């Protein structure tokens, strides 16, 4: 069950019992059953019928910014739910020792992909000495202090493959003032979205997290899990797109802050993303869900949580 990204500026509605998309020019595509997530990258009007219908069908609408940055999410009502699991989610958050295991496990699992990612590309990889610094740290803020270091040093030593135009000196949060930081933060945004979707499909409450403090409107479980899947999807796409040369400066355009992609950059990155988000391993998309199930496997006490490295 695929997702959708509608760039063209049209209007979503429900004439007869199906959804239909009118672009300004004119037509009416889109069978619903078979889509899972809608991503609105354009200026698209939604009608209360298709908005109530989408909610009735359990589909969520992910909105995004002009620049590709996550703007928000439309969360419908909870189809498949359980409070006997959520209570455990909260018990694990409240009990710091067991929270410490899982919160640490996410960085244990994701930074591990990064070493094995950069390793697949034929470069030096020594992250093992940092893991000790995590395993000793008890407080949450220190486990963050590490990932704020690991994340920025991975970039530094990733750069000794790519050309100058695509160099990453530092991460530059919205807005980035360099090139190649749009592609990563934009590619990341969709991974965040896909995460908020594949989390919904489970019984996990997305607002109880371990390595991120949850707030009412915040999805911190997606953020927590994202730490694992950025190097699997974001980095690998952002790599395999920059190398073979499918994106150039013709695709990047600048504003005061120099962050933006042309619709062709957004669409090609979106395509390559949709293309590589499911090749085989028998799916790469389900892995998003299975990795979420693993939490279910640890949260009852069936099997301890083991993160994902690479097939």
């Amino acid at each position: 069950k695929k997702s959708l990204t509608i760039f063209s500026d049209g209007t979503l509605l429900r004439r007869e019992n199906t959804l239909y998309f009118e672009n300004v020019n004119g037509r009416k595509p889109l069978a619903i059953e078979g889509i899972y997530d809608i991503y609105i990258y354009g200026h698209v009007n939604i009608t209360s019928q298709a908005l109530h219908y989408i909610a009735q069908k359990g589909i969520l609408i992910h909105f995004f910014n002009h620049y590709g940055y996550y703007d928000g999410t439309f969360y419908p009502r909870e189809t498949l739910l359980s409070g006997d699991l959520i209570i455990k989610q909260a018990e694990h958050y409240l009990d710091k020792n067991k929270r410490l295991f899982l919160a640490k496990s996410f960085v244990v699992g994701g930074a591990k992909n990064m070493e094995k990612n950069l390793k697949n590309w034929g470069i030096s990889s020594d992250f093992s000495n940092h893991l000790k610094e995590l395993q000793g740290a008890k407080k949450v803020t220190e486990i963050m202090n590490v990932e704020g270091r690991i994340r920025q040093e991975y970039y530094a030593r990733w750069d000794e493959s790519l050309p100058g135009e695509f160099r990453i000196g530092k991460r530059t949060r919205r807005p980035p003032k360099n090139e190649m930081n749009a592609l990563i933060s934009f590619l990341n945004s969709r991974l965040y979205a896909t995460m908020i979707s594949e989390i919904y499909n489970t019984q996990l409450a997305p607002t109880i997290s371990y390595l991120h403090e949850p707030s009412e409107r915040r999805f911190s479980l997606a953020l927590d899990l994202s730490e694992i899947f950025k190097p699997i999807i974001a980095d690998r796409i952002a790599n395999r797109l920059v190398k073979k040369g499918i994106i150039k400066k013709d695709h990047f355009r600048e504003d005061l802050n120099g962050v933006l992609l042309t619709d062709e950059g957004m669409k090609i990155v979106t395509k390559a993303y949709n293309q590589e988000l499911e090749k085989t391993v028998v799916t790469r998309r389900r892995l998003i869900r299975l990795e979420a199930y693993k939490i279910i496997k640890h949260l009852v006490g069936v099997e301890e949580y083991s993160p994902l490295v690479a097939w």
Binding site: T5, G34, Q275, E278
Partner: peptide, 19 residues
């Protein structure tokens, strides 16, 4: 006349459904 809905199996070497 317009983009037809489709259901694909096996590996999807390119998805066009995402527009």
């Amino acid at each position: 006349r317009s983009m037809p809905p489709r259901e694909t199996l096996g590996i999807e070497k390119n998805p066009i459904e995402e527009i």
